Design a binder for this molecule. Structure first.
Ligand code: HEM
Ligand code: HEM
Ligand SMILES: CCCCCCCCO[C@@H]1O[C@H](CO)[C@@H](O)[C@H](O)[C@H]1O
Lengths: 101, 421, 443, 49, 55, 220, 54
């Protein structure tokens, strides 16, 4: 049954990063894999992510959030980086596996 | 069992398959293709150059990492040679690894992914690649030569122009491969393998549909003159005329006139006496120099003439002396014995060309690509010596009478213009 | 048809010796074309302070005509038959060979013999070549790579014969006499110290026959048929630094004394060099290359190129590496390089040698790609091992090599040794000898 | 040209065992090093003490 | 970033740039020894001083 | 001058004579716009045939006179305009040197329309060579030419340059009336002749940009 | 260098850690304790010496 959808949608709203106008992927900690994935993003997707982040930091410093109508909706959250990130981690594991072989 | 056959199937889609078993401990498979800067247009110039360097990028079957690691794992190699009109992707390796190495050769030529990032990263390499190539003045004037000789197709440079470095796109690379790497423009040649085997691989893995994809524009002759004044102590110059195309009885005539005039040295540090052109230029100047009969045969055209290299101050006399040797030859100044000797050097050269695996594989594939067949080393010799002294003198005339194109680089302060020859 | 089988089915190399002491070897195939030549055990090492560069001077006249046939005649005859005439002279070996139609194997053999026995040494041609050789010395002086290797020998074997360059000194070239060259030829180009090798479609018995006919002039005394053993050349851990910040890139070569032809360890050193490999800015492989050093070079842009080498000689040799780099990346390159050398002696892996062994096999097979290269193998083998060594033997030897063996052999020749160093160009960043010496241990 | 370059003579400095140009220097290497390293090891002993 | 820690590490980098790879004139005499001797007296005085201070 | 100028007399090293070649250089650089110039040996400085070209120049079109305006008095511009729909620019090129000169037209156009724009410029030259030059055209041009020259000397830089240039190539000074006198005394014949010398003489061309559609000198 | 704040070997240091130092625009009050700790240290030392003297 659709129990996840119930839970995942609850958490999404509970988390609250959407109050800053940030996508889930905008909040990922930039470790090695993420850094590489970001380098693969297309120009526009990259510049868009940058604006959202710079804007959130501005909100953070002002101690405000966005007006409720601009909050990202659980079903409109774009997993723009997940595809790349997955390829990156796969590749890395391949190298790692091959370097023991 | 050094009495094996040179089989050569030809699947329905038009893909030609030529193999040969010489029982050598090393196999050398290759994928010949009718592609090149010739099929580029103003809009996608250099895309063929980059495609050449893109061979190690990730494919649908193998990752960039595995392509390199895989081949190296078995002491194998992967390279890509190319001319203005043909591209060859070949791999070498010990017999027992032909399977391994094959997967990659396959993926590279038929399943490239040209990932945007990998492509962006690779483009600066074009500057580097081009930089080392251009260290030989030879390469620079030959580029200009083709740009003066033609107005289109063959006029395109073999190395990506500078303004386009970093501008080639993945779309462009994909479109190029889609419209040129078609089963009816490809040939899967192999050595140290068994035809039944090689034949099997083809029909089972080579996909990318048939057709002739986008056809290339006809080569239009121009007869221009490009002069690059760069101050070098040595002056390289090449003067040509539209010669015979690939597959022609006219070709053979020039090949011979070539060797009659002087086609490269045969003795180390030695003079070339059997060289009309060299000997003639030699009598004119006292300083170091070099003259040779230039000759290129392309699908729908060719170029013929002479290439010189001389000190700047003596460029004038050296180039004019090379010209007289051509007129003189056009005016019956060709012995019947000269034509005999040249025919030897020509038969010898061709015969030596095939000693090395690279040379053999290239001989087989080139023909097996431009006519899915294979001339016997006897028929080729038969065709060559059956070239009268008349033929040769005619070739020489076609040159003195035809419109010429010239290209020269260096301190051109004393280099004559095409209209003073 | 397996790799193994193909190796066993390769025609054997036939050798026979004439009474004058000359050896005739050849490997037969079914090729209309062939290469035949005479490999002489001579070179700069056999020269001395007064006649240094004579063997080179000779290499310049060995093609300008004999007594039986002057220049033009000699040239025309060779050219007119479509044959190629080349040759070379090194420190311990010289060679004059011809490429042509098997149909002329005999006429060629006559030509060769005429070259090595009756060189015209035209008094006037000598003065003409004196000026040519002087121009080649200035041309080669701009070949950093070769200037660097010359220097490497100059210091690594300082005080000895292997210290001299093949081309010789300016003074010598300006004063070598018609008599000196003559003397050189007579003293060194002698039957027992030569090898008539040929490969392609040729009859061993037909070769040996033409050989008997032209290679004659037998010796009477015992001093004429004995092959003189050369005095040992002392290796010295040291460095020679030629600085010129005006040069764009810097060349560096480091090396330790090697064993010498006859030693079996060379099979291992070659496998070792195979692990480190080589590299240059045009290797598509890039950051994925198996060679660790190569990978680092790419990542940190450590150099324009680098290569390993195991230069053998009769009783000694040079095992090392050479790289070209920008003035500002020399230190890191040298660091990583010496690092890899330590890894060899200490932590080589089975996977590593597996790959390196394969790479080495296809390398040896590639040195037999044509008649000339195979003919070169024969000349060299008989001249160095006194017998041809089949690919099957090599492969047999290569197969026995494992990680442990690599570590032991490398530890033997590399670990804690005093190297020979040669640096040319903008080398201010290359640290001192002491620091480099420390890179010779622990990892 | 570089051909005209030769390493000077270091006889006034060479250790006795590598003085002769016609003798392998490898045979005295382990002694030459063992000695120098002996001095060093001893200094470490005294220092540790 | 750097192939060897001696140069990349923020602390070692410092020890390396002042006591290992530091460029020094080849001809400085024994009069250039007192700087380091002074540094050693300092550390020595401090050590013995604390020991005395403790009683 | 006399009390300070010391580097002394002579004609110093004389320059080699200018030899005409009539070559063609094409720089393929990918720019959206294609610049091209086609010329022929024109008149030399002082060459009587000078004014003829100066006038033929203004008759064909020597630069804009109205901001953002079209040039109707421009045979060449108007002709090219009728041929292409896209932005462009065409002008009569003219240079006079000591022992030689160059004359022709310079264009600028989008890459795809470079072909038609250059061919259109050529026809305007043939047409002019074939008497297609009104007697009124020659009158107007003589005005623009007299005006231009007269405005050229408004600024100190332009005046000093006028004086000096002539005072250098003949230590003299033509009166602004003699120059005007010399200019208008140029028949419509003269002009049509100049135009002919162009269509008949050997031409040299130079073009840069995305020359994919730019014609070669031998297709003009 | 045109301005001392960047060239001088000592000021260079004060400048790179307390003047031109790049800091996130959004750090809160929880990022204040670092400098407060530093001041406690200087304060404790100062008063400690004064006490030690008696
Ligand atoms: C630049 C370093 C130092 C110098 C030049 C120095 C010098 C001196 C001198 C001149 C004396 C008197 C010795 C005597 O009794 O005749 C002294 C005493 C003393 N110093 Fe230092 N000192 C140094 C550092 C220190 C330090 C770091 C401490 C402790 C943390 C220290 C603790 C003492 C103590 C406890 C005494 C008194 C006991 C005694 O006199 O033996 N000193 N020092
Ligand atoms: C990290 C900095 C410091 C901390 C956390 C610290 C802490 C303390 C504490 C817990 C006491 C006891 C206070 C009491 O009487 O209840 C004390 C005593 C003392 N401290 Fe410190 N101290 C610091 C630095 C120093 C320094 C640098 C000195 C002197 C150079 C010093 C000298 C003294 C003295 C003389 C006393 C004894 C007198 C007294 O107890 O009031 N302290 N300190
Ligand atoms: C004056 C306040 C200093 C606070 C300590 C911060 C640490 O440490 C760093 O070392 C570098 C090399 O010397 C300098 O260039 C930097 O400015 C310095 O911050």
């Amino acid at each position: 049954g659709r129990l996840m959808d119930r839970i995942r949608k609850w958490y999404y709203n509970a988390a609250g990063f959407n109050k800053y106008g940030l996508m889930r992927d905008d909040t990922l900690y930039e470790d090695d894999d993420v850094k590489e994935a970001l380098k693969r993003l297309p120009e526009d997707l990259y510049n868009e992510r940058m604006f959202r982040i710079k804007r959130a930091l501005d909100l953070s410093l002002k101690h405000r959030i966005l007006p409720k109508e601009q909050w990202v909706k659980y079903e409109e959250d774009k997993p723009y980086l997940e595809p790349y990130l997955k390829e990156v981690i796969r590749e890395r594991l391949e190298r790692e596996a091959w370097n023991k072989k | 069992p050094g009495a094996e056959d040179l089989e050569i199937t030809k699947l329905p889609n038009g893909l030609i398959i030529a193999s040969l078993e010489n029982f050598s401990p090393a196999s050398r498979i290759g994928v010949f293709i009718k592609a090149g800067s010739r099929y580029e247009t103003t809009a996608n110039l250099g895309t063929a150059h980059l495609l050449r360097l893109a061979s190690p990028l990730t494919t649908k079957g193998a990752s960039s990492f595995r392509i390199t690691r895989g081949i190296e794992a078995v002491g194998g190699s992967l390279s890509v040679y190319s001319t203005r009109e043909k591209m060859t992707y070949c791999v070498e390796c010990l017999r027992d690894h032909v399977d391994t190495v094959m997967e990659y050769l396959l993926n590279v030529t038929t399943a490239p992914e040209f990932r945007p990032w990998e492509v962006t990263d690779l483009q600066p390499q074009l500057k580097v690649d081009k930089a080392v190539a251009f260290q030989s003045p030879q390469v620079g004037v030959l580029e200009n030569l083709h740009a003066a000789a033609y107005k289109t197709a063959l006029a395109n440079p073999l190395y990506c122009p500078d303004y386009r470095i970093g501008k080639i796109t993945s779309e462009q690379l994909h479109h190029f491969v889609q419209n040129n790497f078609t089963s009816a423009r490809m040939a899967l040649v192999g050595i140290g393998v068994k035809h039944s085997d090689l034949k099997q691989v083809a029909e089972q893995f080579l996909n990318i549909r048939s057709g002739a994809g986008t056809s290339s524009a006809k080569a239009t002759y121009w007869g221009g003159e490009i002069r690059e004044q760069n101050g070098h102590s040595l002056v390289h110059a090449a003067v040509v005329t539209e010669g015979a195309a690939v597959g022609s009885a006219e070709a053979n005539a020039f090949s011979v006139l070539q060797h009659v005039l002087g086609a490269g040295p045969l003795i180390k540090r030695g003079s070339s006496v059997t060289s009309k052109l060299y000997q003639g230029v030699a009598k004119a100047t006292t300083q170091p120099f070099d003259a040779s009969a230039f000759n290129v045969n392309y699908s729908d055209s060719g170029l013929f003439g002479f290439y010189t290299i001389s000190q700047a101050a003596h460029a004038g006399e050296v180039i004019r002396a090379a010209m007289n040797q051509l007129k003189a030859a056009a005016q019956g100044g060709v012995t019947e014995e000269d034509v005999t000797k040249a025919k030897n050097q020509l038969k010898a050269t061709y015969l030596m060309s095939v000693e090395t695996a690279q040379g053999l594989l290239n001989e087989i594939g080139s023909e097996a690509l431009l006519s899915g067949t294979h001339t016997a080393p006897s028929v080729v010799a038969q065709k060559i010596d059956s070239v009268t002294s008349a033929d040769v003198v005619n070739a020489a005339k076609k040159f003195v009478s035809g419109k010429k194109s010239m290209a020269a680089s260096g301190d051109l302060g004393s280099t004559p213009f095409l209209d003073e020859l | 048809a397996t790799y193994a089988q193909t190796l066993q089915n390769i025609p054997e190399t036939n050798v026979t010796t004439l009474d004058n002491g000359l050896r005739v070897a050849s490997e037969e195939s079914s090729q209309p074309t062939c290469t035949v030549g005479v490999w002489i055990g001579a070179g700069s090492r056999y020269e001395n302070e007064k006649n240094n560069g004579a063997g080179y001077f000779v290499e310049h006249l060995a093609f300008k005509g004999t007594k039986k046939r002057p220049c033009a005649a000699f040239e025309k005859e060779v050219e007119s038959m479509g044959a190629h005439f080349n040759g070379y002279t090194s420190r311990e070996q010289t060679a004059f060979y011809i490429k042509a139609l098997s149909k002329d194997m005999p006429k060629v053999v006559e030509l060769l013999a005429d070259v090595v026995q009756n060189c015209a040494l035209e008094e006037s041609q000598i003065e003409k070549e004196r000026g040519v050789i002087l121009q080649e010395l200035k041309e080669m002086d701009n070949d950093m790579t070769n200037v660097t290797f010359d220097y490497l020998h100059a210091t690594a074997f300082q005080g000895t014969a292997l210290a001299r360059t093949v081309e010789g000194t300016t003074e010598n070239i300006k004063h070598l006499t018609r008599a000196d060259l003559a003397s050189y030829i007579d003293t060194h180009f002698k039957a027992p110290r030569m090898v008539l090798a040929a490969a392609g479609g040729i009859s061993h018995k037909e070769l040996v026959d033409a050989a008997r006919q032209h290679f004659s002039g037998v010796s009477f005394t015992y001093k004429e048929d004995a092959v003189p053993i050369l005095p040992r050349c002392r290796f010295t851990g040291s460095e020679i630094r030629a600085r010129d910040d005006a040069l764009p890139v810097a060349h560096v070569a480091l090396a330790v004394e090697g064993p010498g032809w006859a030693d079996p360890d060379n099979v291992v050193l070659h496998v070792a060099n195979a692990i480190i490999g080589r590299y240059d800015r045009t290797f598509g492989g890039g950051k994925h290359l198996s060679s660790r050093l190569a990978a680092l070079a790419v990542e940190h842009k450590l150099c324009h190129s680098f290569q390993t080498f195991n230069t053998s000689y009769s009783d000694t040799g040079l095992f090392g590496f050479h790289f070209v780099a920008d003035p500002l990346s020399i230190d890191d390159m040298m660091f990583c390089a010496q690092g890899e050398w330590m890894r060899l002696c200490t932590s080589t892996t089975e996977s590593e040698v597996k790959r390196a062994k394969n790479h080495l096999r296809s390398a040896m097979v590639a040195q037999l790609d044509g008649t000339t290269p195979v003919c070169e193998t024969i000349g060299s083998h008989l001249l160095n091992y006194g017998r041809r060594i089949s690919l099957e033997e090599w492969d047999s030897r290569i197969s026995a090599v494992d990680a442990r063996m690599v570590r032991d052999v490398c530890s033997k020749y590399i670990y804690d040794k005093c190297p020979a160093l040669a640096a040319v160009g903008p080398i201010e960043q290359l640290l001192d000898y002491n620091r480099i010496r420390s890179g010779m241990y622990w990892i | 040209v570089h051909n005209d370059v030769t390493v000077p003579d270091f006889s006034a400095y060479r250790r006795e065992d590598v003085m002769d140009a016609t003798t392998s220097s490898q045979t005295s290497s382990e002694d030459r090093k063992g000695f120098s390293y002996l001095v060093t090891a001893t200094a470490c002993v005294a220092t540790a003490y | 970033m750097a192939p060897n820690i001696r140069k990349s590490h923020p602390l070692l980098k410092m020890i390396n740039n002042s006591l290992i790879d530091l460029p020094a004139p080849s001809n400085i005499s024994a009069w250039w020894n007192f700087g380091s001797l002074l540094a050693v007296c300092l550390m020595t005085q401090i050590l013995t001083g604390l020991l005395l201070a403790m009683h």
